[PDB]
């Protein structure tokens, strides 16, 4: 009756995570607490990125996360930048920055 | 009508939890869905390689933990590990 997602207090689909694990040819026996752990880690990362992007968007007079502020949050946070270093976000552009040498005065 | 499996829902739930009033566009939703799948692939491959190193034929929560330790930069790793351990503990008790 009680879903494993709610049973663990997580929002992500523990069941779907377990299914994907034992179907992606990763191993031969997916533990009972491995799907829960992976779902929790993914949920934490998603919450972090979503909160950062939402706050960056709200700073810009917006009430809807757009790829721009996703990129901004990903690149401003050192941890997320390291995790997503080689990644590129479509319609994300770059961060505002002008080298001191180029600037006048 | 290719019934796939996007994370557009659970992602939206987490968004409402962190920011109840903040919405998300379709492009941002797809970007988040791609990020989720990318992190899933990374962690799963790392846990598989770990299980193969110890000659284990199963990916247990400990393998996922050790894989998360190898990917997230410290504080992020320390928080992800804490969240995963808390989730597994609460699951084992219910």
């Amino acid at each position: 009756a009680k879903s494993r997602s709610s049973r663990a207090g997580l929002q992500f689909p523990v069941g779907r995570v377990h299914r994907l694990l034992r179907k992606g040819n990763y191993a031969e026996r997916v533990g009972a607490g491995a799907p829960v752990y992976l779902a929790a880690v993914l949920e934490y990362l998603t919450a972090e990125i979503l909160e950062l992007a939402g706050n960056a968007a709200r700073d810009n007079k917006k009430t809807r996360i757009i790829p721009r502020h996703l990129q901004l949050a990903i690149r401003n946070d050192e941890e997320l930048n390291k995790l997503l270093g080689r990644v590129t976000i479509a319609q994300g552009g770059v961060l505002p920055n002008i080298q001191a040498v180029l600037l006048p005065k | 009508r290719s019934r796939k499996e996007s994370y557009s829902v659970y992602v939206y739930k987490v968004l409402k939890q962190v920011h109840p009033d903040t919405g998300i566009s379709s492009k941002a939703m797809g970007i988040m869905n791609s990020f989720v799948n990318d992190i899933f692939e990374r962690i799963a491959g790392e846990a598989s390689r770990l299980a193969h190193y110890n000659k284990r034929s199963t990916i247990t929560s400990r393998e996922i933990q050790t894989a998360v330790r190898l990917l997230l930069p410290g504080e992020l790793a320390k928080h992800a590990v804490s969240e995963g351990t808390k989730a597994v503990t609460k699951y084992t008790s219910s």
């Binding site: 919450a47 909160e51 950062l52 | 939890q17 962190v18 920011h19 504080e75 992020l76 928080h79």
Partner: peptide
């Protein structure tokens, strides 16, 4: 939740 690492909190 809205409670993460001090840098994000």
């Amino acid at each position: 939740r809205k409670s993460m690492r001090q840098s994000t909190a």
